[PDB]
Amino acid sequence: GSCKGRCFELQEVGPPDCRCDNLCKSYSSCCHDFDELCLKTARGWECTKDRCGEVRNEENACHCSEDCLSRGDCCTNYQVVCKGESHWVDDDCEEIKVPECPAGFVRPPLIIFSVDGFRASYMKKGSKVMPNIEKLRSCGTHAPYMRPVYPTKTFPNLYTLATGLYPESHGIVGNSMYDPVFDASFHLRGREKFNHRWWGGQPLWITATKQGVRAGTFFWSVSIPHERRILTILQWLSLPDNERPSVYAFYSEQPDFSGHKYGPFGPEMTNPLREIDKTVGQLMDGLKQLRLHRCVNVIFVGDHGMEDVTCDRTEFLSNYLTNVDDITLVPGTLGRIRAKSIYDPKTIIAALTCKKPDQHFKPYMKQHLPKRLHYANNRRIEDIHLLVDRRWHVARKPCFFQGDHGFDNKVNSMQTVFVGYGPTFKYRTKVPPFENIELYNVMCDLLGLKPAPNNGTHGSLNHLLRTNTFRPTMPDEVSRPNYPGIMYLQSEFDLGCTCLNKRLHTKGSTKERHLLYGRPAVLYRTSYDILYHTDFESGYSEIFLMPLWTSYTISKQAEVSSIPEHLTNCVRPDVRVSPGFSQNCLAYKNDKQMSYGFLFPPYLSSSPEAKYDAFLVTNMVPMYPAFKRVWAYFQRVLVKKYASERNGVNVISGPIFDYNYDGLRDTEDEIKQYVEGSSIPVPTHYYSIITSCLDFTQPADKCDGPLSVSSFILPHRPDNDESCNSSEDESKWVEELMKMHTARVRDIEHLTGLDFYRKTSRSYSEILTLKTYLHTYE
Ligand SMILES: *[C@@H]1O[C@H](CO)[C@@H](O[C@@H]2O[C@H](CO)[C@@H](O[C@@H]3O[C@H](CO[C@H]4O[C@H](CO)[C@@H](O)[C@H](O)[C@@H]4O)[C@@H](O)[C@H](O[C@H]4O[C@H](CO)[C@@H](O)[C@H](O)[C@@H]4O)[C@@H]3O)[C@H](O)[C@H]2NC(C)=O)[C@H](O)[C@H]1NC(C)=O
Numbered sequence: 045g046s047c048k049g050r051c052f053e054l055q056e057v058g059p060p061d062c063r064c065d066n067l068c069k070s071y072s073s074c075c076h077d078f079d080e081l082c083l084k085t086a087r088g089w090e091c092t093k094d095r096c097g098e099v100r101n102e103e104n105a106c107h108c109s110e111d112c113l114s115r116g117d118c119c120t121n122y123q124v125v126c127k128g129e130s131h132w133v134d135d136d137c138e139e140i141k142v143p144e145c146p147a148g149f150v151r152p153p154l155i156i157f158s159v160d161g162f163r164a165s166y167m168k169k170g171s172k173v174m175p176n177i178e179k180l181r182s183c184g185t186h187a188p189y190m191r192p193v194y195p196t197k198t199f200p201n202l203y204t205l206a207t208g209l210y211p212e213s214h215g216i217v218g219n220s221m222y223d224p225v226f227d228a229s230f231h232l233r234g235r236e237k238f239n240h241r242w243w244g245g246q247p248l249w250i251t252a253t254k255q256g257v258r259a260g261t262f263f264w265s266v267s268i269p270h271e272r273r274i275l276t277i278l279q280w281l282s283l284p285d286n287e288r289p290s291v292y293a294f295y296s297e298q299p300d301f302s303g304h305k306y307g308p309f310g311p312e313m314t315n316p317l318r319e320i321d322k323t324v325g326q327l328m329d330g331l332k333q334l335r336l337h338r339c340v341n342v343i344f345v346g347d348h349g350m351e352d353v354t355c356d357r358t359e360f361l362s363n364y365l366t367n368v369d370d371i372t373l374v375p376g377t378l379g380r381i382r383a384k385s386i387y388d389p390k391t392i393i394a395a396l397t398c399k400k401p402d403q404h405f406k407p408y409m410k411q412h413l414p415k416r417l418h419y420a421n422n423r424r425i426e427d428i429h430l431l432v433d434r435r436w437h438v439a440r441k442p443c444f445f446q447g448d449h450g451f452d453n454k455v456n457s458m459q460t461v462f463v464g465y466g467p468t469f470k471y472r473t474k475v476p477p478f479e480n481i482e483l484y485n486v487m488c489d490l491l492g493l494k495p496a497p498n499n500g501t502h503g504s505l506n507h508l509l510r511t512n513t514f515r516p517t518m519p520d521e522v523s524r525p526n527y528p529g530i531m532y533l534q535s536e537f538d539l540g541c542t543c544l545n546k547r548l549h550t551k552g553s554t555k556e557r558h559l560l561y562g563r564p565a566v567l568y569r570t571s572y573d574i575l576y577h578t579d580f581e582s583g584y585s586e587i588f589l590m591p592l593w594t595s596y597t598i599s600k601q602a603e604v605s606s607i608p609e610h611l612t613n614c615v616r617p618d619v620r621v622s623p624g625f626s627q628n629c630l631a632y633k634n635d636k637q638m639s640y641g642f643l644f645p646p647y648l649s650s651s652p653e654a655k656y657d658a659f660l661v662t663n664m665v666p667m668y669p670a671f672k673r674v675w676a677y678f679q680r681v682l683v684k685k686y687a688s689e690r691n692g693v694n695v696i697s698g699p700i701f702d703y704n705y706d707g708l709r710d711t712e713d714e715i716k717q718y719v720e721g722s723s724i725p726v727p728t729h730y731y732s733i734i735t736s737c738l739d740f741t742q743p744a745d746k747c748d749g750p751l752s753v754s755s756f757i758l759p760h761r762p763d764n765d766e767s768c769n770s771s772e773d774e775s776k777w778v779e780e781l782m783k784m785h786t787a788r789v790r791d792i793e794h795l796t797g798l799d800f801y802r803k804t805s806r807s808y809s810e811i812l813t814l815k816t817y818l819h820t821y822e
């Protein structure tokens with residue numbers, strides 16, 4: 045029952061035999077001499093000149109004997125001091141076109157250097173502070189920043205980074221949570237976080253194992269110091285082929301704790317960032333000694349950032365709620381509220397709403413949260429949710445710490461890092477910021493694994509790599525469109541809707557000026573019609589009795605027009621579409637709460653003649669009066685502003701149906717609200733994809749080069765309780781509301797079932813990059 049020659053053994057012992065592994069401390073089940081033999085701390089972590097060629101003393105932490113390399117247990121600076129070698133950092137940038145591995149290595153191994161609470165902005169401290177990390181960055185591939193997932197805590201983001209899944213999917217939705225099925229809670233302290241029932245999806249280390257690729261243990265007991273964690277990875281790498289793992293992971297608790305006490309912008313950050321760099325320099329020195337510095341892919345990545353947060357800035361729910369003792373709260377940089385006695389949600393959220401002028405948080409129903417934060421579809425996520433403002437804190441009842449994290453994931457302070465250095469990674473290359481949901485696939489490709497189903501767009505990050513074994517394919521269309529001409533007659537429609545002669549509603553100047561990037565593919569079985577007009581094209585769904593999409597383009601110089609007093613109630617019937625597959629105004633009269641608006645704006649028609657097309661029944665959708673305030677402003681004002689700033693814009697607006705908040709398209713049965721006395725379904729959100737030329741010196745409709753997209757998914761609310769100053773002019777709130785519900789085109793695709801950018805002069809990998817972009821207005 046000893047750890048003599050078992051320290052950090054990969055293969056597991058299991059009880060009641062004593063263990064010597066990385067997690068043996070976390071069960072208090074290590075052998076008696078574990079701390080003596082495995083946490084050996086004698087004679088420091090660096091070789092010295094006098095130590096060179098020593099006789100192996102097994103009490104020393106690392107070794108400077110010549111037999112050390114054959115056990116992979118040297119100090120990292122062994123060959124630097126003793127032999128004539130140099131530190132890795134003190135060497136020029138040499139490109140790694142091919143992997144240069146020693147004998148036995150079949151694939152290039154992957155080490156994942158994780159750094160907890162490593163804010164993106166820390167990378168600006170530069171070579172003088174972080175010389176090792178700096179080399180990795182500027183020598184390999186790096187992003188300005190990598191975007192975490194909400195709620196930008198550790199366990200959600202590190203497991204998202206492990207699985208490629210949104211927290212809601214894999215189930216680890218916070219550092220602490222409650223599961224009503226289990227009837228138990230998860231905590232960052234305890235042995236409960238080790239129970240496998242909590243952990244869903246499939247992490248990288250299980251994917252690898254299932255495909256016969258051995259994995260080093262990603263988990264490190266806190267008792268194990270950082271110098272030892274590196275040495276253990278380096279010992280494992282020294283093993284024989286049948287034993288040596290291919291995928292590794294290091295975990296630093298820093299620079300999180302430091303940030304929590306001295307803030308992100310403290311000058312006390314320099315020392316904890318210097319030790320992080322030491323740890324990296326140790327790894328990279330240690331790899332060079334094994335001739336692995338031109339063989340190993342090294343990923344340097346963080347979980348989240350850090351923000352300035354003092355105690356003085358804390359909202360208390362006892363000063364908003366009167367029945368405080370009834371509720372349980374998950375506090376801090378976010379809020380999740382729940383009933384104690386297994387109380388009324390409607391009252392709580394109401395009481396938390398726009399109560400004080402300088403209110404530093406906002407209540408939400410999980411489904412009403414911004415869709416970009418895919419934080420709803422899980423029984424662990426509470427109905428009532430609080431989005432707390434940055435720099436701020438929420439408690440239930442009433443200065444040690446000066447920093448914290450956990451806020452909205454588009455917050456600038458919450459942004460973290462990514463660096464790639466290896467044979468497979470691009471040399472001296474810089475890439476756009478990306479989401480951590482994506483890296484699972486890259487890490488899978490780096491190891492030649494088939495990724496498990498996840499929420500990364502697999503082609504999104506091919507530009508990180510010099511070579512990839514995954515060429516993405518644009519999906520096959522399921523439903524072909526009908527192209528109906530004028531079939532029915534004006535007199536044949538009775539819809540309860542009041543209000544030239546030609547070859548009307550035909551192509552030409554329509555599909556070229558308003559579909560600038562090709563017709564969206566549907567990707568699901570449904571009958572729908574293409575409808576041509578002067579100012580817009582649409583994909584009219586015969587099932588929902590409204591467009592799936594409405595594509596149209598506004599030039600920079602395009603002018604705005606007012607809707608007259610006549611043509612205010614005007615809802616014209618569409619002769620191309622049958623009465624059977626059309627809406628009626630009678631339903632909207634029955635429905636006192638519901639009204640209607642238009643997908644294509646009559647505000648931006650070309651001529652007064654063409655404005656009549658904007659009033660077609662095929663262009664009309666169910667809208668609450670409350671939402672019409674939002675939508676009308678967008679259409680009448682903002683589209684023109686965007687068109688002016690961006691030298692024209694292509695707009696693809698449409699309805700979304702998500703009544704089970706799973707972020708995916710609703711089936712017919714899943715729909716809940718129809719308009720009174722009809723089967724016209726009420727949308728939950730309204731999207732728009734506003735595309736233009738990144739080269740703004742060219743018009744949006746004459747763009748040769750890359751595209752530039754800005755999108756959103758506005759919630760179709762019967763009120764503007766969300767927007768606190770909604771009592772004011774729309775010029776004061778509406779645009780902020782839109783910016784809060786920004787979206788990736790990809791997010792809209794999931795929800796609509798549609799597929800955009802089917803016809804471009806652009807590579808498909810680049811289009812996937814464009815579709816995973818998120819506009820942050822930061
Ligand atoms: C992020 O990515 C994840 C992973 O892909 C998505 O989650 C999956 O969503 C799909 C679609 O709803 C789910 O599909 C269903 O899986 C069932 C099998 O379940 C078992 O296996 C999965 C995978 O290992 C386990 O996760 C799960 O616990 C079970 O053990 C099937 O029986 C279902 O059958 C369906 O068949 C056809 C369609 O193919 C239709 O008749 C029906 O749709 C029918 O349900 C179905 O395929 C899947 O289970 C989810 N989990 C996983 C891990 O795959 C997220 O939706 C996605 N988030 C985004 C992008 O918003």
Ligand SMILES: CN(c1nc(-c2ccc(F)cc2)cs1)c1c(CCC(=O)Nc2ccc3[nH]c(=O)oc3c2)nc2ccc(C3CCN(S(C)(=O)=O)CC3)nn12
Pocket residue numbers: 156158160197198199202203205206219232237238239240243247248262263264293294295297300
């Ligand atoms: C989630 N997680 C870890 N993920 C990685 C990782 C994942 C993907 C990568 F690509 C690279 C690395 C390493 S460890 C974790 C941790 C983190 C350690 C910790 O104590 N967290 C922590 C520490 C300080 C702070 N401060 C703060 O504000 O938040 C903090 C968080 N403790 C653990 C423990 C257990 C697990 C489980 C074990 C079971 N397995 S399983 C079922 O797949 O076998 C899942 C992971 N992860 N587990």
Ligand SMILES: [Ca+2]
Pocket residue numbers: 701702703704705706707708709710711714
């Ligand atoms: Ca849905």
Ligand SMILES: [Zn+2]
Pocket residue numbers: 160161197198199300347348
């Ligand atoms: Zn963390």
Ligand SMILES: [Zn+2]
Pocket residue numbers: 161300301304449
């Ligand atoms: Zn933290």
